[PDB]
Structures are given as C-alpha cells and as structure tokens.
Amino acid sequence: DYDGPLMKTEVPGPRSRELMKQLNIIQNAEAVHFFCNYEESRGNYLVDVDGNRMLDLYSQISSIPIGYSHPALVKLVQQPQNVSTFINRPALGILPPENFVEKLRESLLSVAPKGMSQLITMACGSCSNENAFKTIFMWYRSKERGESAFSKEELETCMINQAPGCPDYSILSFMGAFHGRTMGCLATTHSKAIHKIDIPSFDWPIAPFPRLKYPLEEFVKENQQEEARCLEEVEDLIVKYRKKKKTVAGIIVEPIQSEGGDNHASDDFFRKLRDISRKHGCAFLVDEVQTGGGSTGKFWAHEHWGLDDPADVMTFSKKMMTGGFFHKEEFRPNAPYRIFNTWLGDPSKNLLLAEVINIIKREDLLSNAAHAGKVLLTGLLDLQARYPQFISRVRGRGTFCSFDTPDESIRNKLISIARNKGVMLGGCGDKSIRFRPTLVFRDHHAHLFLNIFSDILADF
Amino acid sequence: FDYDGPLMKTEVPGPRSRELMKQLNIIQNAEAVHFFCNYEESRGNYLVDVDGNRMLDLYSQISSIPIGYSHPALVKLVQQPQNVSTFINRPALGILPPENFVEKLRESLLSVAPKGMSQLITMACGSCSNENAFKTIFMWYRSKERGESAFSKEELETCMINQAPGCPDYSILSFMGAFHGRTMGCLATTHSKAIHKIDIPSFDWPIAPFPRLKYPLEEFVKENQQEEARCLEEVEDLIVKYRKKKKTVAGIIVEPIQSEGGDNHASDDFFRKLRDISRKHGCAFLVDEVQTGGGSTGKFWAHEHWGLDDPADVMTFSKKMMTGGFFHKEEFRPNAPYRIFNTWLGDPSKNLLLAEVINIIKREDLLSNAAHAGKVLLTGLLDLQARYPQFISRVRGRGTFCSFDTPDESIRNKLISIARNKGVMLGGCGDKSIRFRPTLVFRDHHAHLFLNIFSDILADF
Numbered sequence: 001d002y003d004g005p006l007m008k009t010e011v012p013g014p015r016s017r018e019l020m021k022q023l024n025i026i027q028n029a030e031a032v033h034f035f036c037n038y039e040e041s042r043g044n045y046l047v048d049v050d051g052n053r054m055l056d057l058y059s060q061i062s063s064i065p066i067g068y069s070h071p072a073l074v075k076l077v078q079q080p081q082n083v084s085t086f087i088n089r090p091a092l093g094i095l096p097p098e099n100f101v102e103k104l105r106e107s108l109l110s111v112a113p114k115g116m117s118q119l120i121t122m123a124c125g126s127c128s129n130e131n132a133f134k135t136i137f138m139w140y141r142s143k144e145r146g147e148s149a150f151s152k153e154e155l156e157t158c159m160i161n162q163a164p165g166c167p168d169y170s171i172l173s174f175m176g177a178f179h180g181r182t183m184g185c186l187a188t189t190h191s192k193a194i195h196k197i198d199i200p201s202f203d204w205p206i207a208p209f210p211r212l213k214y215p216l217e218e219f220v221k222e223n224q225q226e227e228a229r230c231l232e233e234v235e236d237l238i239v240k241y242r243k244k245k246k247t248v249a250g251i252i253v254e255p256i257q258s259e260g261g262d263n264h265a266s267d268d269f270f271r272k273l274r275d276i277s278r279k280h281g282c283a284f285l286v287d288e289v290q291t292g293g294g295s296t297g298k299f300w301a302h303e304h305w306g307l308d309d310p311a312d313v314m315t316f317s318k319k320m321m322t323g324g325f326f327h328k329e330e331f332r333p334n335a336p337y338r339i340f341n342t343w344l345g346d347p348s349k350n351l352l353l354a355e356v357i358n359i360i361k362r363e364d365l366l367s368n369a370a371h372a373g374k375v376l377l378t379g380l381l382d383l384q385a386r387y388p389q390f391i392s393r394v395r396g397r398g399t400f401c402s403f404d405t406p407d408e409s410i411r412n413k414l415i416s417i418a419r420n421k422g423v424m425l426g427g428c429g430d431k432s433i434r435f436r437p438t439l440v441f442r443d444h445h446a447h448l449f450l451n452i453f454s455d456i457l458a459d460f
Numbered sequence: 461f462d463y464d465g466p467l468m469k470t471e472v473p474g475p476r477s478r479e480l481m482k483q484l485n486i487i488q489n490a491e492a493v494h495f496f497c498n499y500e501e502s503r504g505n506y507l508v509d510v511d512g513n514r515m516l517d518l519y520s521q522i523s524s525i526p527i528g529y530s531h532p533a534l535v536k537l538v539q540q541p542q543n544v545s546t547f548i549n550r551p552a553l554g555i556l557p558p559e560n561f562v563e564k565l566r567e568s569l570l571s572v573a574p575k576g577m578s579q580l581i582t583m584a585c586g587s588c589s590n591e592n593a594f595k596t597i598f599m600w601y602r603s604k605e606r607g608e609s610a611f612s613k614e615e616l617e618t619c620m621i622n623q624a625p626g627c628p629d630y631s632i633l634s635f636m637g638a639f640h641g642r643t644m645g646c647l648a649t650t651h652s653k654a655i656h657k658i659d660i661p662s663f664d665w666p667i668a669p670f671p672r673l674k675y676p677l678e679e680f681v682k683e684n685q686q687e688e689a690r691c692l693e694e695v696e697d698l699i700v701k702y703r704k705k706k707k708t709v710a711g712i713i714v715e716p717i718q719s720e721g722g723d724n725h726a727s728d729d730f731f732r733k734l735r736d737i738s739r740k741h742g743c744a745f746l747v748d749e750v751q752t753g754g755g756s757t758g759k760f761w762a763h764e765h766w767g768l769d770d771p772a773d774v775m776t777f778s779k780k781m782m783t784g785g786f787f788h789k790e791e792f793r794p795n796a797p798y799r800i801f802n803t804w805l806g807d808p809s810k811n812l813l814l815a816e817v818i819n820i821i822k823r824e825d826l827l828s829n830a831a832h833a834g835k836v837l838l839t840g841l842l843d844l845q846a847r848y849p850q851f852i853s854r855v856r857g858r859g860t861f862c863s864f865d866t867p868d869e870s871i872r873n874k875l876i877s878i879a880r881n882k883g884v885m886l887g888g889c890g891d892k893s894i895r896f897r898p899t900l901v902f903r904d905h906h907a908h909l910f911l912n913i914f915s916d917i918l919a920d921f
C-alpha cells in the first residue's frame with residue numbers, strides 16, 4: 001500500500017469541520033472525529049477530506065478485516081453476475097437465494113468453532129447477542145418442560161408480558177463488559193455510565209471480571225488469586241439468583257473485554273468459567289464480536305483456551321462483515337419464527353466475507369497477526385521501560401494490544417498528537433490506548449508506529 | 461422492468477428447492493423457508509424460483525422491496541466505478557462518515573422528512589430503530605424531570621449495576637396486536653402471536669386495546685366511533701394507572717396500520733386523538749412506519765393521511781427504505797454523544813440505493829400509482845367478497861395495503877398454497893387473514909392478473 005502517512009493539515013481540518021457543522025444540524029455530531037475519503041483510502045491508510053493520509057490502527061472500531069479498498073473486493077463488485085446480490089435483498093428467513101448454503105460453506109461454515117454445528121445469521125453484534133439470549137432462554141425452558149407442548153396458561157400470559165409465559169430468567173454478565181446497546185444487550189453491558197444512564201434495565205447478576213496486575217511475571221500469585229476470587233463470586237451469584245427465582249439461564253463473556261478497557265484474563269480462568277457454566281446448567285455464551293476475525297493470532301480468540309467444548313453459543317460481527325452466532329445442535333430452536341427477523345443479515349455481506357476468508361487463508365494472515373503483534377507488543381514494552389511516567393500495564397495478544405496512561409487528559413492528548421502525526425489510535429476505558437489494526441497490518445507498520453510514537457514521547 | 465405474467469413449471473416448492481431446503485436444515489431450523497429463489501432472473505413484480513417458476517409477488521420480501529426486482533436504475537448504480545468504494549469500505553458512521561454523507565441524506569431521507577421533525581439518526585433495521593427510539597424517549601423524559609440538574613452521583617453509580625435511580629422504571633405503552641420487532645426491548649411492545657413471545661423475559665409495560673373495526677364501515681359508523689372512544693379511554697386510564705405504579709409512561713408506540721397482528725385499521729380521527737392524549741400526559745408519541753412507510757398507502761408515510769402539522773414526536777422506518785432509522789423533533793435530540801450509538805448506524809450503500817429509489821418514486825409518480833392500483837385491487841376484492849361470502853370477509857385496505865379474512869387458519873393456508881402454485885405469492889397475517897404487500901411498481905393490470913387467478917381458485921375451492 002502507501003509508503004507512510006502524509007499530513008497536510010491538523011485533524012479535523014477545515015473541510016471536515018465544515019461537514020461536521022452541516023451534520024450537527026440534523027443530529028448530535030459531537031462524536032464524529034473527521035470526514036473521510038474512502039475512495040482514496042487503501043490498505044492500512046485512511047484518507048480524510050482534507051487530504052491527510054493516516055496510518056489507521058483503529059480500523060473503524062475493529063470492523064475492517066483486510067484494509068480499505070482491497071483489490072479482491074473491488075473485483076467482486078465489478079463482476080456482472082454479482083449485481084443482483086447488491087440490489088435484491090431477500091427476506092432470508094423465508095426466501096433465500098439459490099447460492100445461500102454454498103456461500104455459507106465458502107465463508108462462515110469454513111471457520112465454525114469446535115462443537116457448534118448450527119449457524120444463524122444476523123445483521124449486527126447487538127441483534128446477534130439479543131437472539132443468542134433468546135436462543136438460550138428457549139433452550140432452558142425446553143429443559144424444564146421437556147418434550148411437552150406449551151401450556152394454555154403460558155400461551156395466554158406471554159402475550160401480555162406475564163409469567164409463566166414470560167419467565168423471569170437472567171443472563172449473568174461481567175463488570176466492564178460491552179455486548180451492545182439494544183435494551184437486552186444493554187442490561188449485560190457495564191462499560192461506561194453514559195452508555196447506561198436513564199435507560200430501563202433488568203435485575204440480572206453482575207460478576208467481577210479479573211483485574212490483572214502488571215508486569216505479569218511479578219504478580220503470578222496475586223493474579224491467580226484475583227481470578228479465583230472472581231470465579232467464586234460467579235458461582236455465588238448463580239446460586240443467589242436461583243434462590244431469587246431469577247434462574248441464570250446463561251453466562252456471557254468476552255475473551256478480552258474491549259470497551260471496558262482491554263481487560264485480560266488467563267486461559268485458565270476461562271476454562272474454569274466454562275466448567276462453572278456447565279456445572280450449573282448455564283449456557284456459556286462467548287461474545288467474539290470484537291475479538292473474532294483473527295487479530296489475536298487465531299481466528300476466534302477462544303481457540304487459545306484449547307477446549308474441545310469451548311462454549312454453547314458464540315456471537316460475531318464487525319470483521320466478519322455480517323453478524324450471527326454459531327451454536328451447539330442442542331440449542332437449535334424447536335419451532336420456526338422464534339428466532340427471526342426481516343433480513344437476518346445480508347447476502348451481499350456473505351459475498352464479501354467469503355472473499356475475505358479466502359484472502360486470510362491464502363495469505364496466512366492469522367500467522368501474520370501473531371508475528372506483527374509480537375513486534376508491536378515488544379516495542380510497547382520497550383517504550384514502557386523508557387517512559388514509565390506515561391506508559392503502564394502494557395498488554396496484548398496478537399495485534400490486540402493496549403496500555404494505560406496516568407489519566408484521561410494525557411490519554412486524549414496523546415491520541416490527538418498521534419493523529420496529527422499521521423497515526424489513528426483508539427481509546428478505551430478511562431485512560432487506556434488500544435490497537436485494532438486491520439489484518440494486513442505487517443511488521444513494518446508496527447515499526448513505523450513505534451518510531452513515530454517514540455518521537456512523540458520524547459517531545460511530550 | 462417487465463414480464464408478461466406468471467409462468468409455472470412445477471409445484472412450489474419444487475424439487476430443486478426441496479433439495480436446497482434439506483441442505484439448509486442441517487445447519488439451522490429451515491422450516492420457515494417457502495422456497496429458494498433465482499434473484500438474477502427476477503424482474504419487477506415477478507419472483508423466479510430455482511425450479512424456473514415465475515410468480516407474481518404480492519408479498520415483496522415481507523414488504524421490503526420498494527421498486528421491484530433487478531430495477532435497471534439500481535443495476536446502473538452498482539455498475540458505476542465511482543460507487544465501488546461505497547460497497548466495500550463500510551464506515552463506523554458515528555465517528556468517521558464519508559465525505560458525501562450529508563449530501564446523500566439530503567438526496568434521500570431528508571427529502572421526505574415528516575412534518576415537524578428536523579432530526580434524523582440512521583439505523584440498520586427496524587428493531588434497532590425502535591430500540592433507539594425508546595432510548596431517545598427515556599433520556600428525553602428524564603431530562604424533563606431533572607431540568608438543568610446534572611446527572612446525580614447516585615444515578616451515575618446505580619446505572620452501571622442496572623439499578624434505579626440510574627436505571628429508571630419507566631415504560632412504553634403499546635397496543636394488543638402490535639408488532640415492533642423482536643429484540644428484547646421491542647419484543648415487550650410486540651403482541652402479535654404467542655410463538656413470537658413465549659419463553660422470553662419481558663417488561664411490565666402497559667398494553668392497550670387497539671380498535672377492532674366492524675365491516676362494512678358504512679354500516680357500523682356509530683359502533684366504530686364507540687369502539688375507538690373505548691380504546692382511547694383505556695389508553696388514558698393505563699397512563700394514570702402506571703404513573704401511580706411508579707412505572708411512568710415515557711412514550712406511546714403505535715403502527716398507523718397494524719401489520720403482523722392482522723392488518724388492523726383505525727380512523728384518522730383515532731390517531732389524531734391518540735396524539736393529543738400522548739401530549740396531554742407528557743408522553744412522547746412514537747409512530748412505527750417500518751412497514752407502512754415508503755408509499756404503498758398512497759402517501760409516502762401513512763401518518764400523512766391524518767393531516768397533522770404535528771403528527772408525532774418520533775417516527776421509525778426500515779424495510780422499503782433500505783436503511784432503518786428515525787426522524788424526531790429537535791427537543792428529543794440527545795444532549796451528549798455516545799448515548800445513541802452503535803458500530804455501523806446503518807450503511808452508506810443502502811443510502812446510495814435509497815436516493816435512487818426515491819428519485820424513481822417521484823419521477824414515476826408512484827405514490828399516486830399505489831393509490832390507484834390499490835383502489836382497483838380493493839374493488840376486485842369487494843367483488844370476490846360479494847361472490848364468495850363462505851370464504852371472504854372484512855375486505856379492507858388503504859392504497860395497496862389491503863387484506864381480508866378467511867374462515868380459519870387451515871383455509872387461509874390452503875388458499876395461499878394454491879395461489880402460489882397458480883403463480884401468485886401472497887402473505888398471511890393474524891390468525892386467518894390474507895394480506896397484500898405489492899412492490900411500488902405494482903400496477904392496475906397486475907391487480908387484474910391476480911383477481912382473475914384468484915377468481916378461478918375460489919370457483920374450484
């Protein structure tokens with residue numbers, strides 16, 4: 001792709017600021033950071049409307065899998081036979097296209113997690129998780145009622161939002177979690193107050209997620225004890241909510257908590273959590289919406305746990321272009337029209353995804369993520385050694401890396417400075433800086449960032 | 461743009477469809493699948509399946525295809541080299557919009573904004589449209605109550621752990637028979653069929669009766685007036701009841717025509733009065749036009765029939781509009797960013813297509829066409845109703861948004877099955893209703909193609 005970044009103005013520049021003013025008329029546009037020229041963007045480089053070309057290590061909140069304007073995807077749109085897929089969107093649940101199954105074989109089914117033979121598609125991460133919740137609730141009621149018909153009382157009360165038709169079951173989630181913002185998802189989200197405030201919720205159990213101490217090899221015992229404490233509280237919560245007649249039907253967790261501030265835990269913790277879930281008859285729901293797609297060095301991050309039975313349900317979106325969830329055969333809905341909506345994804349996204357997965361495989365991009373990520377993490381550890389007054393808790397897996405700054409203002413200042421220097425970084429939590437490079441992020445991009453950021457720290 | 465009429469080769473689903481349905485059933489419950497389709501050969505009003513059957517489609521992918529299959533104007537868009545990026549570079553629209561984002565909105569959604577609603581946020585589907593409409597309404601209501609006070613310390617603390625006062629116990633009032641989506645917030649306001657709701661945790665929110673009109677309308681003028689008045693009273697009683705329960709109604713959601721519940725209509729007067737009740741109790745009035753929106757009732761938005769300068773506070777849309785989202789009044793604008801947000805907030809490629817759809821709707825006078833084609837369709841249905849009272853009752857509609865009842869679910873399903881094999885795709889709704897959702901290039905001559913086919917079916921039934 002491009003050789004390096006190229007800056008012409010401060011960001012946002014005059015043209016971005018004019019467009020931001022226009023947009024702010026019709027909606028709150030305070031979140032916009034600048035306007036983009038995607039036609040001129042290529043690979044790891046994002047071009048804005050003021051002609052600035054920045055190395056993008058945020059990749060549209062970790063949703064761009066193989067870079068901007070990838071030539072393989074360009075070729076797809078150029079093919080006359082693919083026109084119909086872009087302009088004839090089906091109600092997939094009732095009238096799928098002829099190639100629906102074969103395109104699924106070329107894409108999502110070719111990367112199915114272990115033990116999960118079932119797949120339903122969805123259009124985003126939020127309806128992926130919402131429908132995973134519903135799939136779990138249905139499965140749990142199925143266990144309880146066995147091979148029996150719905151009762152007349154259930155059929156009548158569910159229509160008016162009452163038990164027993166509408167059970168008071170719960171999903172257990174973790175502090176620091178982010179699972180989406182529709183009202184079901186939002187109940188399991190515990191990232192920032194501004195995400196949650198003034199919105200009605202569910203009285204569902206909330207467990208602590210381990211806060212590891214760094215550097216890791218100095219706090220081995222403390223961290224295992226921290227993880228042990230959290231696992232105990234999960235089990236206590238499950239028991240407590242069963243007593244409250246609010247049975248925990250499932251547990252949802254991210255393999256790495258993203259929006260909450262890139263919180264990591266050992267593979268051992270997740271294996272033990274998986275066991276706790278099974279032990280109490282809770283469905284284990286793993287949210288790979290952000291970790292999925294290969295940046296951790298394996299296609300799904302949970303693959304690092306080395307389990308033949310990693311989970312019951314697994315959701316995905318972002319890098320996968322389409323959303324959806326894999327699940328075990330036993331979680332298959334017993335009747336149609338229970339897990340359903342108009343579009344259930346989009347065949348055009350499946351078309352693109354199939355080519356993305358082909359590229360990832362052909363070009364060995366999973367291995368590349370591991371390699372480039374190590375270069376990045378090693379460099380971050382060096383800068384942490386050299387600038388302890390600015391950098392701490394350097395952590396990561398693959399390119400999925402992050403570190404903390406002393407406070408929020410410094411975090412924001414560093415991001416602002418880096419952006420004007422031609423590097424786009426993301427923030428998470430109060431004072432963390434995170435990396436979500438696309439999968440065509442290579443060694444030399446890592447070296448480029450490190451050398452730019454090193455100069456930034458020296459001048460800071 | 462065109463085929464002559466339907467052309468059938470096999471029963472539906474045919475052998476190739478049944479084979480593909482068998483394959484799909486391995487990886488997921490595929491019992492809902494009607495058949496597999498050849499969209500490449502589908503054109504205008506006609507859906508072609510994998511067995512070569514060509515059917516007149518009066519269901520239009522659950523009322524979501526706006527100007528028919530493989531429209532040449534949309535073909536042209538995908539063919540243009542300058543549009544490639546829009547299809548393969550999907551932005552996080554909330555933070556990094558494309559250069560043409562505002563202008564393409566001016567060409568599309570903003571050019572059909574409802575009266576009194578200066579604000580617009582885009583969403584990817586009807587469910588997240590309604591969910592975020594709810595949230596916008598909750599934040600607005602809380603903002604009313606705390607005035608200029610900042611977020612209290614207790615609110616900021618409790619909201620992180622799903623507790624009041626940070627998470628208020630406010631409610632959205634909805635109607636029996638309603639359908640607003642299936643995510644857990646939406647679902648609480650949905651009251652369509654049991655199979656949609658059963659075994660899913662819900663919210664204790666007020667549920668009002670939706671008027672059940674009696675037909676023919678001109679023979680039940682007094683009764684229908686009284687029915688609507690009854691429902692309006694019960695709406696108001698519920699708001700008061702739930703205020704005392706400390707589960708304050710922050711908003712009221714309603715469809716201008718109930719779809720999935722069984723194509724239930726109500727007078728323009730009813731909705732005007734409901735709007736007034738909403739305002740009176742300080743509830744936001746949220747109109748769900750996900751299915752009624754996009755022109756099939758003869759006006760772009762169905763609520764336009766009401767004739768109000770202030771028709772609602774918030775209005776959601778999707779399906780025919782290609783993208784979802786919601787218009788709303790300025791006073792409902794979120795005070796801070798990242799409260800109404802998600803990764804994609806729609807998709808610029810859908811906005812690209814929608815701008816051209818809206819261009820076609822205006823240039824080909826398709827709003828007026830829907831009113832005309834719909835009148836022809838309805839007149840024919842009323843004739844079949846007079847000729848076959850053993851099978852057809854309560855013929856009703858506005859524009860092409862038409863429907864009628866059959867004696868029972870068994871007969872309803874049989875008629876749909878026979879019609880499909882005779883080259884016409886129909887939809888069902890409610891217990892025993894048959895509904896029509898033709899695309900906007902449905903013409904009076906397509907109405908007659910259907911009517912003549914269905915007339916022969918009824919004669920042999």
Ligand code: FES
Pocket residue numbers: 122123124125126127128182583584585586587588589643
């Ligand atoms: S909720 Fe996922 S696209 Fe609307």
